[PDB]
Design a protein around this ligand. Structure first.
Ligand SMILES: O=C(NCCC(c1ccccc1)c1ccccc1)c1cccnc1
Ligand SMILES: O=C(NCCC(c1ccccc1)c1ccccc1)c1cccnc1
Lengths: 545, 545
């Protein structure tokens, strides 16, 4: 089973074709005058050549004007002064945006096994403002198995040849595929070939028919999760920051550089729901494997993971990439790292944002051990101190380790208080952990394979530089954070609790805030939609400026 | 032997300190009033704390104002209405630019074995416009073994402690290092420690002393080559564009995306002299290993290298990277590829530029073999047709192969006419080729190691799709290139000759041009300086728009 969608009038509205109507009604020109000069000559006509890839759009612009002159001459009328055909088409193409509900339908269909494809009559766009069209196509493109464009295949969609091409591309019998189009003429051939068709007038009715014939709930369906990341479809970057320390990252999009720093014990993949969203919002996302994780190097020495060397290496990372600046968004331990980036390298940080992780200034008086002991929820951090112990139980069963950890506010299974002395992190934890509703088995197996490379030594070493970090932090006790800064709290995070951030204003006067209801500690995958809304909104106003 | 440079007044002019003089003379304020409130309190003073990293610049701004008030109060004067200390420092820092001649000196010194370092009194810049300072520092940073900043080490350069730190960092005896500073006070301690010092008033005199004491020609020295690329200091990107085809690239800088496409038989490294330059000019450079080369996949099948699949894969490359558009700059075969990107995917090409490679439209009448036979200089292309033959002699001795090829206009050694029948490409070529003046032995060994991975099959396959490329090109015979386009010709390129481009205007009406004197076929490394000037100038006006 497969599904095929037209672009104009189906996956994109308002249909550009419907500008040759508006324009007439607006200029009070004779009904059809435009849509006639547009199709003048039929197959031999300029527009058909334009659509077959014989000529470019800019080449076509003049041809359409001559027709409009010769079309209004026979109709015995005359177009105004600065009647601009380019002007009309510019705002028409620009006005046309994605049909979100129709895209959802395609998504679900594909999610449930359908081969999806876009088949459109279109042109080679060489306009000065062609990038707008290319941006839309890229966004749509990614969601379909195939994109067949008339100007690329040299065929045009009324012609029966392109339909045989479609099926050949799809590897499917006509009877096996649905075909949606806003133009009836372009429906016949598919119908005649024996495949299901749907004249698309209003979107919801078409989806009714679609849902109707597919036996799949498409309409009124729940709000979907943001687009995720298939690891092997990603651009992977590698930078050596030191004799034998190499950092790995995934990169997507263009615009201001946004560096995403995950926490413990995670990876770049923990940003899977925001990487596409932020790129889409006009940003260049660099999602890190922090030192010790995934494809980044993982040196055994503890001091390799104190905040001073971690931050210095991040600075070197920008250096090697030719970046004077980046916005740093961190979560958990990454959030900690991000606050220190802000305090120690303001020149390098376009803006700082933390998820869950508050900024707590060091206490010059109390040892970082007294202070951490002074919090019952941080009992497992004393457990992490002795090298090898925590590694052993965390590395013993990887799938179990993550299935236990990566859980929602409710479905917890870990006794996080009284951990070390009562045994370990998984004292009375099932050795057969249920699958969280936040994660599929596949996503868990990704973290499993990642951690098979270096294990937990490196990650745990982040916990073993308390006295070093404390000494370093004490240097910044006279400083304030005065660059754009955003703190986001998660209600149900029971160790990185919202209340811990209550005093941050003192140190970060212009601090902007965000908060998420019923969100646990794994913010990115727990509430991806709201997370994306909050960061994208904050970037637009504080990062791009 | 080592060399140490101050920033302000030494590697950067005009000295920011010298704004507390200008400002006074401009506002007709009492001599010194500013430079006094600036240093008020000495060690305990705000500025010293600012320079030690105790406070940020923005924290310091208010402290300096109070002093100026209290400093003008004792002097019995009063500052004007909107006397803005921030305003003064903003334009001061912004006005300060690199001292090019002083940087050259550092470069040469380092090139000849010196350990170089910058030692400066500086601050943590949290200004809204801090990025300007960060950009300068990044550019300078890269050229030195070490960058020691007062606000980072908690020490300040008058203090003797920072000097011991400097030497410890340098691993050198005082007697072994030179130390240049514009402030005499900051010279004493180095002198007292026994190291050579140079009060820097005018740059040329300081360089006279420098050259004088180093025994190295630093002044009046020839124009240096552009900064190059150390492969292992680069950000390396990897994108899978197909089931088993992966593309490798090097990435540097931010701004509009610039995709550099090398020719035959080369690599990303062939852009080594422009990658840093273009990044510096405000662009995000993606230097490709084209399909078949270096760390990119090299499938054995010939059709894997026809222009249609090569271009489609480049399009996929943008897709995976989240790029709607890129400017495509090609040389040789890359230039060919770039013209087809423009003809077949205008939406994707911000702008097109070719080095040496003209745009010649296909001849619908003559076979691509007749046409290529019709040119004596293209005799070696018939030699490339039969699979295995050319691979064999090209792979037989890699160092020889490149040493023979990569040669300047003059120092040629290859009989390029009557090649196949008279034996091979290296018929009467020395098996012990001299080293070209364009290349060091090291750079040759880089290409050698790269080509040890896949050999020449893939590269040569670019030559084996003539009939396929011809058929594909014939589709575009009705089209014109109307996006920003630039053609650059090289006088002494005796196969890709300037005259071949003479008709391009017909197909590319708004075509901009460039030309290089006494430049051979290996344009990038032959005339890197002029190449950079031409592309950077064309990008600024046609790419950024
Ligand atoms: O320990 C930190 N984060 C780990 C938080 C995470 C967890 C993972 C494994 C074992 C124990 C805890 C967790 C899992 C479930 C619910 C809440 C938190 C930390 C420390 C300092 C600064 N920033 C972060
Ligand atoms: O053959 C092409 N370039 C190779 C040019 C290069 C060369 C390398 C090896 C063997 C033979 C020639 C060369 C070396 C020295 C001087 C001039 C050219 C070509 C073909 C079509 C389109 N664009 C480029």
């Amino acid at each position: 089973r497969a599904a095929v969608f037209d672009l104009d009038g189906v996956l994109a509205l308002p249909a550009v074709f419907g500008v040759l109507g508006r324009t007439e009604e607006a200029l009070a020109l004779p009904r059809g005058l435009l849509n006639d000069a547009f199709q003048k000559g039929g197959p031999e006509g300029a527009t058909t050549r334009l659509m077959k890839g014989e000529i470019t759009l800019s080449q076509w612009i003049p041809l359409m004007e001559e027709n409009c002159r010769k079309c209004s001459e026979t109709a015995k009328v005359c177009l105004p002064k600065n009647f601009s055909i380019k002007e009309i088409f510019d705002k028409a193409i620009s006005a046309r945006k994605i049909n979100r509900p129709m895209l959802q339908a395609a998504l679900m269909l594909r999610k449930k096994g359908f081969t999806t494809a876009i088949l459109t009559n279109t042109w080679l766009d060489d306009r000065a403002e062609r990038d707008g069209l290319a941006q839309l196509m890229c966004e749509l493109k990614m969601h379909f198995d195939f994109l067949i464009e008339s100007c690329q295949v040299g065929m045009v969609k009324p012609e029966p040849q392109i339909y045989k091409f479609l099926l050949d591309t799809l590897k499917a019998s006509p009877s096996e595929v649905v075909f949606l189009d806003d133009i009836g003429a372009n429906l016949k051939p598919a119908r005649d070939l024996g495949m299901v068709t749907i004249l698309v007038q209003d979107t919801d009715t078409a989806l009714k028919e679609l849902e109707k014939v597919t036996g799949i709930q498409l309409l009124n369906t729940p709000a979907p999760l943001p687009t995720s990341c298939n690891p092997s479809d990603m651009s992977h970057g590698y930078v050596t920051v030191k004799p034998r320390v190499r950092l790995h990252f995934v990169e997507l999009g263009s615009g201001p550089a946004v560096c995403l720093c995950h926490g413990f014990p995670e990876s770049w993949y923990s940003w899977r729901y925001q990487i596409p969203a932020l790129a889409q919002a006009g940003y260049r996302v660099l999602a890190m494997d922090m030192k010790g994780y995934g494809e980044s190097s993982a040196p055994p020495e503890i001091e390799e993971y104190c905040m001073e060397v971690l931050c210095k290496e991040m600075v070197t990372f920008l250096d090697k990439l030719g970046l004077s600046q980046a916005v740093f968004i961190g979560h958990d331990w990454g959030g900690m790292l991000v606050w220190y980036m802000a305090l120690f390298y303001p020149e390098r940080v376009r803006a700082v944002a933390s998820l869950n992780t508050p900024f707590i200034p060091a206490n010059p008086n109390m040892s970082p051990l007294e202070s951490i002991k002074a919090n019952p929820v941080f009992d497992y951090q004393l457990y992490f101190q002795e090298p090898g112990v925590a590694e052993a139980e965390l590395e013993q069963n990887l799938s179990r380790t993550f299935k236990s950890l990566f859980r929602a506010s409710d479905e917890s299974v870990l006794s996080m208080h009284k951990v070390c002395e009562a045994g370990g992190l998984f004292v009375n934890s099932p050795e057969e952990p249920s699958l969280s509703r936040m994660v599929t088995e596949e996503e868990i197996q990704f973290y499993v394979q990642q951690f098979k490379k270096s294990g937990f030594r490196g990650p745990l070493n982040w916990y073993r530089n308390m006295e070093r970090n404390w000494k370093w932090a004490c240097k910044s006790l006279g400083r304030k954070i005065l660059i754009p800064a955003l703190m986001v709290t998660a209600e149900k995070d029971f160790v990185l609790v919202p209340q811990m951030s209550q005093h941050m204003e003192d140190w970060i006067p212009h601090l902007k805030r965000g908060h998420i209801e019923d969100c646990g500690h794994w913010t990115q995958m727990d509430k991806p939609t709201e997370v994306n809304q909050i960061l994208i909104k904050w970037l637009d106003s504080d990062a791009r400026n």
